[PDB]
Symmetry: C2
Subunit: 156 residues, 2 copies
């Protein structure tokens, strides 16, 4: 129902799980290059992923190109540096949710241009460790989907 | 805040991500044997997991042993066969959330003894494919945590 954006994702397997998440939820996926793997890589293609789950994906050469072609109504950034939790904001149609690489956050230069209200974080207890990108994305997507009533969902 | 249960988890890497999820959320993890790997396996130990994140984990020889030692107030089962969504039930202290293996569901014999109101499912759109166990667990945990106010959470 919304658009999800991977800022320079690095690991093939995470992106494959996110591609599956997006196809299972109706969320549209975007990837901001450089990616840490070729689009043709085998750890992704043979991840057991079905090719129908692809080509709803958009690749962008830069973050500025992405902004230019998508002109997101509101862009959110999942960052350990955000204050409101991911479930503490009210998502809406037109929202784009952006995620950083699995080994570093979304650049400060980008984050510095977003209002504090759109820099969100997944809660964690004291002295936690980084959560896997795909788990982060799954959590955020399902929470935004929950808020929007799971439109498109259907049973077994 | 609640207890999470893996019914015969099979793959080491998923369980390692779930162990991290549980330590990051304060959720207590239980594993119902047989596991698909030895507790000492290397794909788990060197997954980059820190050993503090362990030994809050409980292993149970059978599902009946688990019921005997834990006597869950309410036991939920995440199954593609459930009707209410995971966010459609109201979680409470004392709840135990159970998950099946990554290649099959929780046995029908077990599911047959649970009320329909406690067999829950993560929504999916038409013709979706199985979501990765760790993504399933992350999604459920964070939704139950959200409902309970993220107690224990703290900032950077």
């Amino acid at each position: 129902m919304l658009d999800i954006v991977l800022y320079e994702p690095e690991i093939p397997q995470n992106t494959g799980n996110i591609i599956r998440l997006c196809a299972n939820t109706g969320f549209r996926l975007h990837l901001i290059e450089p990616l840490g793997f070729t689009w043709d890589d085998k750890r992704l293609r043979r991840s057991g992923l079905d090719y129908h789950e692809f080509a709803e994906i958009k690749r962008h050469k830069t973050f500025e190109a992405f902004l230019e072609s998508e002109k997101p109504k509101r862009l959110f950034a999942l960052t350990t540096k955000g204050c409101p939790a991911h479930s503490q904001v009210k998502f809406k149609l037109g929202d784009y949710l952006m995620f950083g690489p699995e080994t570093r956050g979304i650049p400060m230069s980008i984050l510095n241009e977003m209002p504090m209200e759109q820099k969100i974080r997944i809660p964690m207890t004291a002295n936690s460790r980084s959560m896997n990108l795909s788990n982060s994305v799954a959590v955020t997507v399902y929470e935004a989907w929950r808020q929007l009533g799971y439109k498109g969902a259907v049973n077994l």
